[PDB]
Swiss-Prot record:
One of its GO terms (biological process) is abscisic acid-activated signaling pathway. It comes from Arabidopsis thaliana. N-myristoylated. GO terms for molecular function: ubiquitin protein ligase activity; ubiquitin-protein transferase activity; zinc ion binding. Residues 28-248 form the VWFA domain. This is E3 ubiquitin-protein ligase RGLG1. The chain holds residues 129 to 409 of 489 of the full protein. One of its GO terms (cellular component) is plasma membrane. Coiled coil: none annotated. Ubiquitously expressed.
Length: 281
């Protein structure tokens, strides 16, 4: 499906213009980066046995994903300010996020996101386990504080939410329970959630994850497998557009939904204010 579309897009500019014609207007970007220790070994097949956070003169999957999503959504960003958070390191585990800059200062453009990412990475202690509840809750807080302006949260992660040891008897882990609850609660806000999977995974349980999310007023969640798309044997510029479209083509209908539901521009009033920890640097 997305492959059939992207075959006719030669640049990210074309993808951006398409999102514009599909109804996307002023749109804000929030980025959450997975800093769990698993990043050390999930690059086995996908990244030459290097850490997914390994820095060099070639961008790692995080930098690549940021660049592609950043370039595509930049035209819709009126203030060009991108709240950025890390999670899954030793300072946050599955309980918190930390802001890329002290006092929660937003990054100025995706270029600064990239630069500041490279500054922070070598000073982190990677940990775990994996939950997306703190980063989704942080996004909720930002949306509410902005008085209900539309946001797209892009989570870039190298694993699914941590499962229960007793998952085979139908039990959810706290990480799963709180993450699913956050996804549902987020649908009461003008917020779209995109989970970008990098590394080896496994990612084969995501469609079933998606299928089991409880009923929401609109479908506010998308998973996209960066690795699978960028591993294809086809043109590089064409892999980029396919990724951008796969990650973002559902955003304009979601945006339209936040308008039809009258979520846009209003404060919900039931959003706990999550505080981001300082960057542990
Ligand atoms: Mg991980
Ligand atoms: Na913005």
């Amino acid at each position: 499906r997305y492959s059939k579309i992207s075959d006719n897009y030669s640049s990210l500019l074309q993808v951006s213009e398409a999102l514009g014609r599909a109804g996307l207007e002023s749109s804000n970007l929030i980025v959450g980066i997975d800093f769990t220790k698993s990043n050390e070994w999930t690059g086995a097949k996908s990244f030459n046995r290097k850490s997914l956070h390994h820095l060099s003169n070639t961008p790692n999957p995080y930098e690549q994903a940021i660049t592609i999503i950043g370039r595509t959504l930049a035209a819709f960003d009126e203030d060009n300010l991108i709240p950025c958070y890390g999670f899954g390191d030793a300072s946050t585990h599955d309980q918190d996020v930390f802001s890329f800059y002290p006092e929660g200062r937003f990054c100025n453009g995706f270029e600064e996101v990239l630069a500041r990412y490279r500054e922070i990475v070598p000073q982190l202690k990677l940990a775990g386990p994996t939950s997306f509840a703190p980063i989704i809750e942080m996004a909720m807080t930002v949306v509410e504080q902005s008085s209900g302006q539309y946001h797209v949260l892009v989570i870039i992660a190298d694993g699914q939410v941590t499962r229960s040891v007793d998952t085979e008897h139908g039990r959810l882990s706290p990480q799963e329970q709180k993450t699913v609850d956050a996804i549902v609660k987020a649908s009461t806000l003008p917020l779209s959630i995109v989970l970008v999977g990098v590394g080896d995974g496994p990612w084969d349980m995501m469609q079933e994850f998606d299928d089991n999310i409880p009923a929401r007023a609109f479908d506010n969640f998308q998973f996209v497998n960066f690795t699978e798309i960028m591993s294809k044997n086809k043109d590089q510029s064409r892999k980029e557009t396919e990724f951008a479209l796969s990650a973002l083509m559902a955003i304009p209908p979601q945006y339209k939904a936040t308008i039809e539901l009258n979520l846009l521009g209003v404060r919900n009033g039931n959003i706990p204010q999550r505080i981001p920890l300082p960057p542990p640097v």
